[PDB]
Structure 1
Amino acid sequence: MELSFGARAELPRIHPVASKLLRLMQKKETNLCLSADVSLARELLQLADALGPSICMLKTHVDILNDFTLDVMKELITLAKCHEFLIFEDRKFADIGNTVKKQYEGGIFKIASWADLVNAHVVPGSGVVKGLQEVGLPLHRGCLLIAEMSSTGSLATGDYTRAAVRMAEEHSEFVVGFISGSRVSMKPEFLHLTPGVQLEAGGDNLGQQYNSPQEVIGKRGSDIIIVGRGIISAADRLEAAEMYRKAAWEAYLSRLG
């Protein structure tokens, strides 16, 4: 009884940020999240503009942007609105609730002011979510919980993964899904986003491991692929993004049947 992205966007318990995302995924035929892991604002913005039509989401690491300003993020929002994609700051909040609330709202990045989505590790216990939601619920934001990781030696397995799913399902007013390698929740209101994706087999020299779009979307049941170097290190990033988009989209279609 698997529903399309467009039908999932209408589910009774859907979060509004998840619904917006699912609707634009269906409209644009994309379940690709670009991992824009660059250090220059101009490159970030040029990628966002050119690849915007091909992506459902742009994932940032603003803390690696050498020339971050809030006005860069204003320009990114313009592109996100134009091309219709969400902005996901991959901050991996991972502290006690009292600390993460300040890290999300404040400092020089003011993440909550521009990021539709953020994510959190579950290791601190549910206070990490409660602290973020003090800021994010008034701002109509969503959060993803890290239930599994792609890297060698990941401890996000077994009972840890189960705890992440329970934490999400108990904070569904704010948590909209997971970073995971596979479908971890049986509730269709939750999004599954999977990093560690390339077309070719392999990894990196610092513990990254890759699986293909067909494997992660088609076999493992995830919704969205997160792709960094498979796109950004290519010469033609637009054609690379299109290859990843077509791969992930067809894997999704074939699995709906």
Structure 2
Amino acid sequence: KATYKERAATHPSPVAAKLFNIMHEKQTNLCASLDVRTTKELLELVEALGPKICLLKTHVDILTDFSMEGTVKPLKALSAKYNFLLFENRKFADIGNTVKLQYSAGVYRIAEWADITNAHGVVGPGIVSGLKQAAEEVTKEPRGLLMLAELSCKGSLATGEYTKGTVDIAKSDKDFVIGFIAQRDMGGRDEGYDWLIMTPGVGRTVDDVVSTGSDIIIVGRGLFAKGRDAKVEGERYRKAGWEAYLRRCGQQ
């Protein structure tokens, strides 16, 4: 693949280009996935990890005290201060006005602040066109979507065929669908697609996933649980992921 810097200069999606630039500038391909109960704990961890991440994956549905004023406002401020994007967990899986409103409205109003979101492909391309239309009506700010091509939960049904079908759906909109949550490269280069591959469950080792084609490593509890120091772990994983990236052979 091309370097993050190169991909930022050519990508059709403004959000993807913005993310690739952050990665190049901050020398990080680390995404911190934080699943905590309170806004206080969330903001604490984000403050500590901000300098070392390119992306923050939030889990607003498990927060007990989510609010636009108390959660989103300070989170957006941290995003701006430390320069990283916001990716909300909510795994959309519907179409039409139902999915548009689950994304744009409700108490969470995800589309108003989440730079990136993800969707299950099982419901068909309607989830892509629906979320795209909702994003456009909500804000002029760049928005992008990741398809959940390969899941890692036990007994998941994201088989080869399902993944192939998901990749095909992604090809319907290279402007809005910026990549996948997956465990391996999804190809596409020969066809003019440049997909971001974000891989969770990293601790498989960083070297393993980055070598197989992962562009971003999504690390969760390994960064803050069990009395760990998030600032220290943020640097550990950032260094590991960046060095693995530098060792990978780029397109010459």
**TM-score (structure 2 length as normaliser):** 0.93
Letter in 2 for 1:184: M
Letter in 2 for 1:237: A
Q: 2:26 aligns with which of 20, 24, 28?
A: 28
Equivalent residue number for residue 147 of structure 1: 149
Equivalent residue number for residue 245 of structure 2: 252
**Is 1:107 matched up with 2:106?**
yes
Deviation for aligned residue 1:144: 0.5
CA contact (8 A) 1:137 1:174 kept: no
Which deviates more, 230-239 or 71-80? 230-239
Equivalent residue number for residue 121 of structure 1: 120
Deviation for aligned residue 1:7: 0.4
Equivalent residue number for residue 173 of structure 1: 175
Which deviates more, 147-156 or 102-111? 147-156
Deviation for aligned residue 1:241: 1.4
Deviation for aligned residue 1:95: 1.2
1:71-82 matched pairs, under 5 angstroms: 71=69, 72-82=71-81
CA contact (8 A) 1:143 1:174 kept: yes
CA contact (8 A) 2:12 2:175 kept: no
Deviation for aligned residue 1:137: 3.2
Cα-Cα RMSD:
1.2
Distance 1:6 1:256 in 2: 15
Letter in 2 for 1:26: H
Gaps of 5+ in 1: 199-210
**Is 1:196 matched up with 2:198?**
no
Deviation for aligned residue 1:6: 0.4
Equivalent residue number for residue 45 of structure 1: 43
Deviation for aligned residue 1:251: 1.1
SS at match of 1:10: helix
Residues 126-183 of structure 1 show CA distances to partners (whole Å, capped at 9, x for unaligned) of 1111111111134331110000012232211211111111111111121111000111
Letter in 2 for 1:192: I
Q: What percentage of aligned pairs have identical amino acids? A: 50
Letter in 2 for 1:238: K
Distance 1:106 1:167 in 2: 25
Equivalent residue number for residue 239 of structure 1: 232
Q: 1:216 aligns with which of 209, 221, 229?
A: 209
Distance 1:16 1:25 in 2: 14
CA contact (8 A) 1:74 1:114 kept: no
1:114/1:255 Cα in 2 relative to 1: closer, same or farther (>3 Å)?
same
Distance 2:81 2:207 in 1: 29
CA contact (8 A) 2:125 2:172 kept: no
SS at match of 2:123: coil
**Is 1:228 matched up with 2:220?**
yes
Gaps of 5+ in 2: none
CA contact (8 A) 1:45 1:75 kept: yes
Residues 8-56 of structure 1 show CA distances to partners (whole Å, capped at 9, x for unaligned) of 0011x42000000000100000000000111110111111111100000
**TM-score (structure 1 length as normaliser):** 0.91
Equivalent residue number for residue 208 of structure 1: none
CA contact (8 A) 1:4 1:256 kept: no
